[model samples]
Structures are given as structure tokens and as C-alpha cells.
Target: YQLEKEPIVGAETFYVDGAANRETKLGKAGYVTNKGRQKVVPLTNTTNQKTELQAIYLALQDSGLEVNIVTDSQYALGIIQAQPDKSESELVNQIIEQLIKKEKVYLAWVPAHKGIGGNEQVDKLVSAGIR
Candidate 1:
């Protein structure tokens, strides 16, 4: 996993994560900014994997420019690296546009369940039971 500490330019890094409830068969998306702001994105009928991308997309949309997004989903990064336009999921392709076309965002992967602050906080937000 490549960990980004300084976040390179003036961009603020945002940590993102997603979760699924096996019993409820529902999903949630979460993000925590470097400034300590947090949010849980609303999703419907999305899979555990899809929600990961959803978090990235929503966070990028929410954060206007020069944003660095951190995540634990190697799969999402792989898809982004592979092919955004031809990706199986439409959302993946759209996110690739933000990453490649807009060039205002950066994505990096880190080990999950580590002591990373934003990761831990966003995990809690996603697991809030959606009450």
C-alpha cells in the first residue's frame, strides 16, 4: 500500500470508506476530511464494492478542487488504473473522469483497519447503523 503523508500540493486529503450490512443487505458510504469534517453519503441498492467508489465520487463532488482522496480499496484503484471508460461499472468510469479529466483529485490506497485517523472515523460513520 502506498501511503501519502504530505498530500503533495495544496490539496487537502480526504479519507473514504464503505460498508454493507449482511442482515439488512444495505450499504453506506463515508468520508472524513483532513480538517476533521465527516459525512455519510446516502446510497441505495449498492454493493459493498460499489459503495467504495460512491464514497470517492461523492467526496470529490463535495470537495470542489485540489483534493486528495485516500482509501483502502485496492479494487477501486485498480479499476481506475485499468480503464475508466471501459470499466464494468458506470460510476467507476465517471470517477475516472474526475481523476483523469479534471485532474483535480488524487487517489491513494492504505491498509485497512490501521490506526489512520480519517479511516477510523469514516468507518464509524459508515457503521452508524443508518438509524
Candidate 2:
């Protein structure tokens, strides 16, 4: 399906976000599913891009069907749309495999920190993952 800028109806929607700490160089992936299930994962070498990709990966793994994932990072979408290089093939490959396994996961984009409820919650989770 085409990437959407708004939430899709009748499907489980996941609001995904990533947070990176410059001082510690740590990164985190956080997401909140509309069903109220949410998670925050810490990463050792997490760049902002990689963390966002990881959020998408984790979401797709838990996502069984009719899932819509919304992210604020346009770069993340472009990366997924393009081919994976050998540099980040592990995450790129896992995301691809997870997506292919689902067959029909929808993607959406939204501006970060826009006061949306789920996005807000996920943001807090990301921060909490770091500290």
C-alpha cells in the first residue's frame, strides 16, 4: 500500500519513534500499538536512523496482520524503499523479511512531537529507555 500521512482505520496502528543520546551515544526504539501494547528497546550503537528502522522492525515482528505503522522520519521510509547495503544488512534484512512475512503492512508518516497521544506516549518511552 502507498504510504499515508494519516492514520488508517480498521487496522492496528503503531506509532513508532527513536531517540538518540549524543553524550552517551546510546539509542532507543519505542512504539505504541493502538491496542495499548507498547515497548521501548535500548541499543548500543543506535543512530537515529537505525533506531527508527528498529522500531519498524520490532513492530512488524509483533504485527501479525492488518497493521499500520506511523513514523515521523521520512529518511527511514526512503531507506526502506531503497536497497540495503552490506553495511546495515542485518536490520535491513530483518525488516524486509518481517515485511514480506506480513505481506501487507501499511506505513504512515507524521511530524514528530505534534501532540498526538500515542506518539506522545512513545516519545516518553524512548526517553525512558535511555534514562
Candidate 3:
């Protein structure tokens, strides 16, 4: 009898956030790899949904690693789900296109300022990006 090895299930989960002012926009993403390494990335010249999507894309591009993304922006999630508004269609399309190339990606919505570990870390990174 051959016992098929159970598929190893793992993912690189990230908490992401974005912030913008009248003149500047920023995005931040935080994640811990399977080996317990923590890392954060901040982006500039990106705002609103674009920032969030960029972070998601970063994770999705890592082939062989599933991704679990958490965000506070429901608007961005709605666009990912194909319910985009007219003004957002172009950028939203870009996101979907990238998404289609990835093997596995999952998104979860969390309320802001909820004190979740990864969420709070990403929020702080956004503050850093804003500065």
C-alpha cells in the first residue's frame, strides 16, 4: 500500500497597509516566513488601492509559497473580487492579471486598529512610510 504523503501546507502571511497625504502616498507590508523570520517593506509614490495591490502582488509572485494577506481596506478587496468602480477599473485589472498568474493567494479583511500582531506591525510600517 502506498501512502501518499500529505501535501505540505504552508503560506507566507502578510499584513499590509497604506496611507496618503495630499502630496505623498505610501504602502507597507509585513510578513514572517516559515522559519520565523520577520521582515517589512515600505513603498512610496503609491496610494490607496494601488499600494495594497502592490503588496499583494509581491507575495503572489513568490511561486511555491501560498499567501495569506490581511488588510483593512475593504475597497481594495472589493476590487479584487471583481466589483470595481469605474475609476478603479484600470488599476483593478492590473491586480487581477497579476493574481491569475499566482498559484495560491488568499485575502482576509480585518478591522483597523484591532491590535492583531501582524496588522499592528504593518500599521506601524505605514506610519514609517508616511514620515
Q: Which candidate do you rate higher for TM-score, 2 or 3?
A: 2
Local distance difference test values of all predictions, in order: 0.75, 0.77, 0.59
**Model 3, C-alpha of 75: deviation from truth (Å):** 1.1
Q: Which stretches of model 3 miss by more than 4 angstroms? A: 1-9, 25-45, 63-65, 83-91, 129-131
TM-scores, each model vs. reference: 0.83, 0.84, 0.67
Error of 1 at 115 (Å): 0.4
lDDT of candidate 2 vs native? 0.77
- C-alpha lDDT of residue 74 in model 2: 92
lDDT of 3 by residue, 1-131 (tens): 01112223466666666655447555554443344544556666666566666655555554333556677878777766653434445655665665655556677778978887777776666556364
- Weakest 10 consecutive residues of candidate 1 by summed lDDT: 1-10
Q: What TM-score would candidate 3 get against the native?
A: 0.67
* Model 3, C-alpha of 17: deviation from truth (Å): 1.6
Q: For candidate 2, give the lDDT of residue 20.
A: 84
Off by over 4 Å in 1: 1-6
Number of clashing pairs per prediction, in order: 0, 0, 0
Query: Candidates 1 and 2: which is better by lDDT?
Result: 2
Clashing pairs in 2: none
Residue 67 in candidate 3, Cα distance off native in Å:
1.8
Q: Write the per-residue lDDT of candidate 2 for residues 11-104, one digit (tens) a residue.
A: 8888998888777879889789889889888888667888888898888887766678988889878866554533356888777766666645
- Say which prediction, candidate 1 or candidate 2, comes out ahead on TM-score: 2
